[PDB]
C-alpha positions as a LaTeX table, in Angstrom:
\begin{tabular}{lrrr}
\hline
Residue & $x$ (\AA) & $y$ (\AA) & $z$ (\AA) \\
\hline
Unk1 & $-31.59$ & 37.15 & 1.29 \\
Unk2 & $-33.58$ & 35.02 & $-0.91$ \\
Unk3 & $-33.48$ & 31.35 & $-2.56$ \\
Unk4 & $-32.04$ & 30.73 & $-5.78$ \\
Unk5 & $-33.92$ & 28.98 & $-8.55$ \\
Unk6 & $-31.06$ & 26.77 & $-9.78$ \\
Unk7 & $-31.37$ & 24.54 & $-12.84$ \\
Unk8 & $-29.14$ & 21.30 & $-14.10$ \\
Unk9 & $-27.80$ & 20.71 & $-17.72$ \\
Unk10 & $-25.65$ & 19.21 & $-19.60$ \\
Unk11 & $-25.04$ & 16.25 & $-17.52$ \\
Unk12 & $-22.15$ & 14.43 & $-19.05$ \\
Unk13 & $-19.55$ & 11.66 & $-17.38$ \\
Unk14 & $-17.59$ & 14.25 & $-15.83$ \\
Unk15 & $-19.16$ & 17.63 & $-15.57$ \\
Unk16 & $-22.66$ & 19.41 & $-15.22$ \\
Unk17 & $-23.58$ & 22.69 & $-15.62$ \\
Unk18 & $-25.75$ & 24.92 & $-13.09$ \\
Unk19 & $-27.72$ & 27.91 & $-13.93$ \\
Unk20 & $-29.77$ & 30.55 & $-11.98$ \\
Unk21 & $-31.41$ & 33.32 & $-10.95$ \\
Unk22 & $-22.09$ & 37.26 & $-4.33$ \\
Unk23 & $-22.58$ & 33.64 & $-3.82$ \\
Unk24 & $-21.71$ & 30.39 & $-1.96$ \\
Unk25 & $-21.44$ & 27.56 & $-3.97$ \\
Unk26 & $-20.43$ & 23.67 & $-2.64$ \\
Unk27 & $-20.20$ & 20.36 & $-4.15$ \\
Unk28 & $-20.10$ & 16.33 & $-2.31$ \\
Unk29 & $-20.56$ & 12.70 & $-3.07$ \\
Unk30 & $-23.22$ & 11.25 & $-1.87$ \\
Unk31 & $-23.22$ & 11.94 & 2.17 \\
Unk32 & $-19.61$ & 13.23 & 2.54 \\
Unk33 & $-18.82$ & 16.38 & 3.55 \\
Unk34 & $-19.37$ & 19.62 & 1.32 \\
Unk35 & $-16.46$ & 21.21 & $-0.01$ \\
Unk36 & $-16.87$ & 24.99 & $-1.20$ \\
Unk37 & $-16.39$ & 26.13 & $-4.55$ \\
Unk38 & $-14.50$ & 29.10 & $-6.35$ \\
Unk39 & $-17.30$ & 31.14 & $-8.53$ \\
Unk40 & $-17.00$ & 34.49 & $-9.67$ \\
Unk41 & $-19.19$ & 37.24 & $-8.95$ \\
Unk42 & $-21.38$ & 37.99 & $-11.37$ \\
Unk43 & $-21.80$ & 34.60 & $-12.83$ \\
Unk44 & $-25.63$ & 33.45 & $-13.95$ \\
Unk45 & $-23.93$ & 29.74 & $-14.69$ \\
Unk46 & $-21.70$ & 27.45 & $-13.58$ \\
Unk47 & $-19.69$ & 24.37 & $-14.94$ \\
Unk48 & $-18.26$ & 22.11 & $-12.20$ \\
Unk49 & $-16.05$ & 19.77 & $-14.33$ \\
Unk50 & $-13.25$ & 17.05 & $-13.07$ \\
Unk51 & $-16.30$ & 14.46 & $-11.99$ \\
Unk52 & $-16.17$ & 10.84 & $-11.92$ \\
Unk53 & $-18.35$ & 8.92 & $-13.88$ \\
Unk54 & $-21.55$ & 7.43 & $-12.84$ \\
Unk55 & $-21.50$ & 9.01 & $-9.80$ \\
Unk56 & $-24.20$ & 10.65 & $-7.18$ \\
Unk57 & $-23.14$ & 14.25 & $-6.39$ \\
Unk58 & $-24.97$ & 16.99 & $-4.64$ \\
Unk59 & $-24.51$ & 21.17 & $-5.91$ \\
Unk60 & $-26.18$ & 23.86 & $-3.39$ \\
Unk61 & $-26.05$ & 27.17 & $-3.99$ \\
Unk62 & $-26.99$ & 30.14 & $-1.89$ \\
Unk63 & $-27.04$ & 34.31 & $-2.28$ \\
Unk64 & $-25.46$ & 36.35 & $-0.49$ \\
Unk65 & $-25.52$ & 40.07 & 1.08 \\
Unk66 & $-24.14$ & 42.03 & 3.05 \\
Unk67 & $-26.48$ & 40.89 & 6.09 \\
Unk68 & $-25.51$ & 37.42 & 5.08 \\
Unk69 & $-26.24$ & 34.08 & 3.12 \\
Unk70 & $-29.81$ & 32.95 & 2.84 \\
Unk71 & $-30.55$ & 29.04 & 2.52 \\
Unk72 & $-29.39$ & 26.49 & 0.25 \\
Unk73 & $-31.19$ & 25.80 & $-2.71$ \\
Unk74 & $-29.47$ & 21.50 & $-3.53$ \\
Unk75 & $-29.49$ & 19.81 & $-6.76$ \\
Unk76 & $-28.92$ & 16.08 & $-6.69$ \\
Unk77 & $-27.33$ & 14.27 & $-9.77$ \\
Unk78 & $-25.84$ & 11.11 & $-10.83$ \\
Unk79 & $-23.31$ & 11.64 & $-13.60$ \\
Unk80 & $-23.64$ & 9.83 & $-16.95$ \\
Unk81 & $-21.57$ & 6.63 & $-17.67$ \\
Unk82 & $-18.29$ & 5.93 & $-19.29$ \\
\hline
\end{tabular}
């Protein structure tokens, strides 16, 4: 089970988008606990929207299959302002 290459755009004051290349996807603000995301199967991107505003977040995303997940690949952001 490998480790996805995940990429961040389209940072705006309440959203981001993920991209890469079954799955386990989980969100937090800075140094609270992970909550786990609802994404489809196969899904190459992601937009988690319903952010606050300047705000540091953390995304990880790992693969799954049927032996299990493999390890988190984490994206740190802070969102933009206003």
């Amino acid at each position: 089970p490998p480790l996805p290459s995940i990429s961040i755009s389209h940072v705006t004051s309440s959203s981001v988008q993920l991209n890469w290349e079954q799955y386990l996807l989980e969100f937090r603000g800075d140094n609270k606990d992970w909550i786990k995301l609802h994404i489809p199967n196969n899904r190459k991107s992601f937009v988690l929207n319903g952010l606050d505003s300047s705000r540091r977040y953390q995304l990880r995303l790992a693969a799954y299959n049927r032996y299990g997940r493999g390890d988190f690949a984490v994206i740190g952001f802070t969102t933009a302002h206003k």
